[PDB]
């Protein structure tokens, strides 16, 4: 690939991302002072474990649906065989959502935009997965500190998805070429914008994997305690990706 071509790829990834945002960044910033009251937080804590799990699984599924659309719009993804597309989305959808989540995280007061307002991690207490929640908050805090631009999130999440090391890929060399092209697009944009200082500050290899594994582990405990709730009221796409 050449310079005009690499920049054409930068523009394309950024457009694909902006078109597949569930939440507008400006809407998330303008909602910062709309914080849940102590009474509303208490209301969330009083909810049953199953009710809170179902609400969160549904919100995650909705976020995953936008990630599926991002993949479909991503240059080179629809050219890969259906097996590889499914492999990349099954391993990467949740990882992309985890990165996208830093935009809904306010690092000034440690709050997240959830169901119309901002609330602290105490909001999720009824889930019974405090370690997982605090880790996702800490991860969101770490990305927020980097001051990620929308274009940086677009390029970085395109690379979270197009990972040639995913077990099960049939056309591995084809995914490797698409990955190298997106890596150049990413690194060229950081170089052009004087943002190469962030490379060393980006999450370590295995961190996104660790969060996804913990999510799957906590879902398996929850499923063991409430199997009918999962079977009857969890979204079909969520069960397909995380249950089995």
């Amino acid at each position: 690939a050449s310079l005009t071509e690499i920049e054409h790829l930068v523009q394309s990834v950024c457009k694909s991302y902006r078109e597949t945002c569930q939440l507008r960044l400006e809407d998330l910033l303008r909602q910062r002072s709309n914080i849940f009251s102590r009474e509303e937080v208490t209301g969330y804590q009083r909810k049953s474990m199953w009710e809170m799990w179902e609400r969160c699984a549904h919100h995650l599924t909705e976020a995953i649906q936008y990630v599926v659309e991002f993949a479909k719009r991503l240059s080179g993804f629809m050219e890969l065989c259906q097996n590889d597309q499914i492999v990349l989305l099954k391993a990467g959808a949740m990882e992309v959502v985890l990165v996208r989540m830093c935009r809904a995280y306010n690092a000034d007061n440690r709050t997240v935009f959830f169901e119309g307002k901002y609330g602290g991690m105490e909001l999720f207490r009824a889930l019974g997965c405090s370690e997982l929640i605090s880790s996702i908050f800490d991860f969101s805090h770490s990305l927020s500190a980097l001051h990620f631009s929308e274009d940086e999130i677009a390029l970085y999440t395109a690379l979270v998805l197009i990972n040639a090391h995913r077990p099960g890929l049939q056309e591995k060399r084809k995914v490797e070429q698409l990955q190298y092209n997106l890596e150049l697009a990413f690194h060229h944009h950081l170089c052009k914008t004087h943002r190469q200082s962030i490379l060393a500050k980006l999450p370590p290899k295995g961190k996104l994997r660790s969060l996804c594994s913990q999510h799957v582990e906590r879902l398996q405990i929850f499923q063991h305690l409430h199997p009918i709730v999962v079977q009857a009221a969890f979204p079909p796409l969520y069960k397909e990706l995380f249950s089995g």
Partner: peptide, 10 residues
Amino acid sequence: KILHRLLQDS
């Protein structure tokens, strides 16, 4: 089932 359907939907 679901993922296949989302990818085929044009």
